[PDB]
RNA sequence: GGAGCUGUCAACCGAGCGUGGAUCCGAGGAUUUCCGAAUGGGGAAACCCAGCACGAGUGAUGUCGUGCUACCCGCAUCUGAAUAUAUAGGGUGCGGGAGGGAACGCGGGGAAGUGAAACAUCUCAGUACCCGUAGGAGGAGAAAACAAUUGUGAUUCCGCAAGUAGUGGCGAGCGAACGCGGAACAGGCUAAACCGCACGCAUGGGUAACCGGGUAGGGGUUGUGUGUGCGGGGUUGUGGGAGGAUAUGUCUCAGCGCUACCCGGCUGAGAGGCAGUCAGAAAGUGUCGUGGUUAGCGGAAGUGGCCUGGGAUGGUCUGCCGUAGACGGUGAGAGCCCGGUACGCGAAAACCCGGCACCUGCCUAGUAUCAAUUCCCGAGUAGCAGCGGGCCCGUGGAAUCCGCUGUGAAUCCGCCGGGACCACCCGGUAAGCCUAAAUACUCCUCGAUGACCGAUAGCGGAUUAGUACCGUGAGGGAAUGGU
RNA sequence: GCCAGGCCAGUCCGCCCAGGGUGAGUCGGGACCUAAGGCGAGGCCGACAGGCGUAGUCGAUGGACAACGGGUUGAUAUUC
């Protein structure tokens, strides 16, 4: 919650949890920035 | 709670007919529309400290008027014409000399 | 007009006389308004409000002040 | 007559009467309501009532 | 809350109020005409006429103000007609009901059009509608259940099972359950036998042989039996209780149970334990909440240059904030001009919820073993028959469930169910009551949203809208936005 | 007053605007009486809804009950 609030109202920036990733948001984004633990959690959830 | 005689009498009636009856020492008032003759007579005697020979009353309906598209009605009124006893002090309306 | 603070000291009979004389003033104001000699027409509302105030004080007195 | 019992409140029932062509029309099943001049204490005043033969057959009320 | 205000169509004025805090917003209280369930009596709703009591007024009638005066039901009391017991009825005093509301629930009554290419069985449909009656939900709910040789274990609702088994002028059609996966879970009181106390009838109207049992007596007459009420006891299906033989007291005190004793038992009090506004008993007084609801307040950052322009929120250079770049307004597309937004504070009082107390209530040994004689386990009930209703089931071989009529049991070696019926086996314990949650709905109040409408659209209704107007009436029912 | 209305026109108007105007012991009604009829305490009947009706109470178009003549206003008069 300390880091989500920081980029919350930046225009063009979209926030979502690793377990809510979806094709529409990925395809609309130009770059996907993962936090390290978020990326590890997403990878672990798929093995 | 307590009743005052001045709640029955509302205003004097100011008109040519009223002014004609002042010369005869007959006074016209607008009274509350649910009073009766005896009540009005008692109230006038108590308020103006004068003898009253008789009281006559009449109801009058309000007029219909249209303003934008539909009629509206004015209030109905009850007038009381009060004639004093032959030899009693005149009532000073304080601004109705006639 | 008259204040409730300055009305809450009159006992019962001064209240009853203030009521009666205020009613008399209202009667006179009504006749003056009818015959066209009243200039400050805001007096009617003031007298009506002080009469209402006197009733309010009396009623609250007789029901658990 | 008087299809309601004054003790147990037993009222009429509703059903169908069925002809040979199996055509069904509404009818009623009335309780067997009979008149009784009942007393409370023995030798007392009699009160008229409308009770069913089941209540009469039991000891519910006495003449 | 903080400088203007005296609502709107809808201005023109007039006259005033306001930092000694107005207008405005919230809460509590006061007043509250007449009609309306309308309820003193009457009545063409919004009107008319009273009676009683207490005050006001008059020389006295006249007059005025404030309370009470409908009917039915329940409870408590006084009276007890014909008429005797008595009852019907009557008087008094306390409580309650009535009427309305958009939907949702439960119980009852119950169409037709239509489909069957006609039509009557059937369908439509237990629908529309009507009647009774609720509650914030309701109903149902604790096995006289399913299952089938293993077993599950109150009810409700959702998904399957399944358009299946079936059922149908076997036509048109209609259509389960077993079981499986889920949401939510919770169980409790009574009747009866038997024991006590009042009221009732007998009987002894004294042989009661009873007065806690006994250890012995006396009063020896009130014992004995039955009914209606109030306490104890008891609540189960591997049957459980009651009553008998082995076994003993939450702790004390007093009283009573006839007298000295054993064993006790009952009542009252105190001492403890537990529970509580609950289905399992009901109210009320306090006090306290980082609790909630009903007003609100603060809240970062551009007077930037030039161009066009009536006007910059546009273009182009620059500066900045951001836990705030939601939305809207302002003279044209505004995070930085305004209301606000993120975020964070805020309650005299009233109401709601929670806690702690007060208070209220319950608990004053029976546990275990044996005996297996006796009593009890919800009656005009179950069952059976007739006629119907409803179940997949349209009467069929028709079980299970419900109604009316007749007939009419048994209390565990009983009774009921397992789809006619019989035998065996299995399951359960009807004819008494209560019970949260999971489910349904929105007249209404707040807060959001829309690949919804944009004035012939969207509500009938952006405009006087259920208005104008039409109809005796029930009813029907418009059009009208933009400097 | 004259732009709508009046089957033409209109200075007029039952049209539009403002103000004024209806005075009762005796007149017509109530506070008096009842008819046909209505409602209807209890009541009887009826599954419910409800039907009918006694006491009673409403209900004139009927019964009972006191005023005539003159004058006056722009508009009331058995009313002043
Ligand atoms: Mg008043
Ligand atoms: Mg006269
Ligand atoms: Mg008159
Ligand atoms: Mg006009
Ligand atoms: Mg009946
Ligand atoms: Mg049919
Ligand atoms: Mg029977
Ligand atoms: Mg206020
Ligand atoms: Mg208020
Ligand atoms: Mg009334
Ligand atoms: Mg009436
Ligand atoms: Mg007698
Ligand atoms: Mg009701
Ligand atoms: Mg048909
Ligand atoms: Mg057909
Ligand atoms: Mg056809
Ligand atoms: Mg309620
Ligand atoms: Mg319930
Ligand atoms: Mg008992
Ligand atoms: Mg008991
Ligand atoms: Mg602010
Ligand atoms: Mg320029
Ligand atoms: Mg803009
Ligand atoms: Mg914006
Ligand atoms: Mg601006
Ligand atoms: Mg059948
Ligand atoms: Mg059958
Ligand atoms: Mg039978
Ligand atoms: Mg079988
Ligand atoms: Mg049983
Ligand atoms: Mg129940
Ligand atoms: Mg429930
Ligand atoms: Mg429209
Ligand atoms: Mg348009
Ligand atoms: Mg009409
Ligand atoms: Mg003209
Ligand atoms: Mg013309
Ligand atoms: Mg009646
Ligand atoms: Mg009738
Ligand atoms: Mg009559
Ligand atoms: Mg009459
Ligand atoms: Mg007549
Ligand atoms: Mg004339
Ligand atoms: Zn019966």
């Amino acid at each position: 919650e300390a880091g989500a609030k920081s980029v919350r109202n930046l225009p063009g920036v979209h926030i979502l949890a690793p377990d809510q990733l979806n094709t529409y948001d990925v395809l609309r984004a130009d770059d996907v920035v993962f936090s390290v633990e978020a990326l590890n959690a997403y990878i672990a959830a798929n093995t | 709670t307590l009743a005052d005689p001045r709640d029955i009498i509302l205003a004097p009636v100011i008109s040519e007919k009223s002014y004609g009856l002042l010369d005869d020492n007959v006074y016209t008032f607008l009274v509350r529309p649910d009073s009766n003759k005896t009540q009005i007579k008692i109230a006038v005697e108590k308020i103006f400290a004068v003898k009253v020979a008789s009281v006559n009353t009449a109801n009058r309906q309000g007029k219909r008027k249209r303003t934008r598209t539909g009629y509206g009605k004015r209030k109905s009124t009850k007038r009381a014409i009060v004639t004093l006893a032959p030899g009693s002090r005149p009532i000073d309306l304080f601004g109705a000399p006639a | 007009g008259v204040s409730p603070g300055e009305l809450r000291e009159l006992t019962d009979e001064e209240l009853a006389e203030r009521l009666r004389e205020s009613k008399e003033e209202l009667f006179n104001l009504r006749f003056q308004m009818a015959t066209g000699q009243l200039n400050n027409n805001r007096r009617l509302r003031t007298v009506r409000q002080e009469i209402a105030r006197i009733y309010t004080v009396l009623r609250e007195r007789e029901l658990g002040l | 007559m008087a299809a309601v019992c004054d003790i147990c409140g037993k009222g009429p029932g509703f059903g169908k009467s069925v002809s040979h062509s199996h055509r069904r029309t509404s009818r009623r099943w009335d309780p067997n309501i009979q008149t009784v001049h009942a007393v409370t204490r023995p030798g007392g005043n009699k009160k008229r009532l409308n009770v069913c033969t089941s209540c009469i057959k039991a000891g519910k009320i006495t003449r």
Side-chain angles (χ1 to χ4, degrees), chain D residues 10 16 22-24 26 30-32 41 45 53 57:
Chain D
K10 158 144 73 187
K16 301 293 178 196
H22 209 263
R23 184 176 176 86
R24 310 162 58 196
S26 296
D30 286 333
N32 198 358
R41 69 209 290 287
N45 282 162
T53 61
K57 202 199 205 177

Side-chain angles (χ1 to χ4, degrees), chain C:
Chain C
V2 168
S3 176
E6 65 183 1
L7 269 192
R8 286 182 217 280
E9 307 86 331
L10 295 175
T11 69
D12 280 19
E13 69 275 16
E14 317 89 313
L15 274 189
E17 294 294 328
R18 296 291 295 273
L19 190 75
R20 179 209 56 80
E21 65 183 1
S22 179
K23 279 172 186 301
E24 190 185 295
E25 307 289 35
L26 185 57
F27 181 90
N28 292 315
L29 286 187
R30 286 204 317 257
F31 279 14
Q32 285 186 348
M33 177 31 69
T35 63
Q37 293 82 17
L38 190 61
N39 200 46
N40 188 18
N41 49 78
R42 308 255 63 62
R43 300 301 322 296
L44 278 297
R45 183 180 63 83
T46 295
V47 173
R48 288 201 302 263
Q49 272 162 356
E50 50 188 44
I51 295 172
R53 211 164 289 134
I54 295 169
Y55 289 167
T56 295
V57 161
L58 275 178
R59 191 40 171 177
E60 88 183 16
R61 187 153 306 177
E62 74 187 2
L63 304 171
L65 77 164

Side-chain angles (χ1 to χ4, degrees), chain B residues 27-71:
Chain B
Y27 307 88
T28 312
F29 308 100
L30 288 156
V31 300
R32 185 179 67 189
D34 78 323
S35 64
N36 59 69
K37 272 175 185 175
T38 293
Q39 163 163 39
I40 289 161
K41 160 182 283 202
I42 298 174
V44 162
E45 283 183 326
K46 184 55 181 263
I47 290 179
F48 296 98
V50 71
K51 298 293 183 182
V52 178
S54 66
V55 172
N56 284 352
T57 60
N59 294 282
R60 207 193 274 165
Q61 306 291 93
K63 292 188 195 179
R64 272 202 312 157
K65 302 275 172 166
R66 51 160 163 290
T67 71
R68 79 291 184 275
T69 186
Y71 292 92

Side-chain angles (χ1 to χ4, degrees), chain D residues 36-56:
Chain D
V36 174
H37 295 269
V39 303
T40 65
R41 69 209 290 287
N45 282 162
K46 293 187 286 185
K47 182 175 174 66
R48 180 167 91 232
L49 283 152
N50 274 333
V51 306
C52 59
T53 61
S54 296
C55 294
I56 303 175

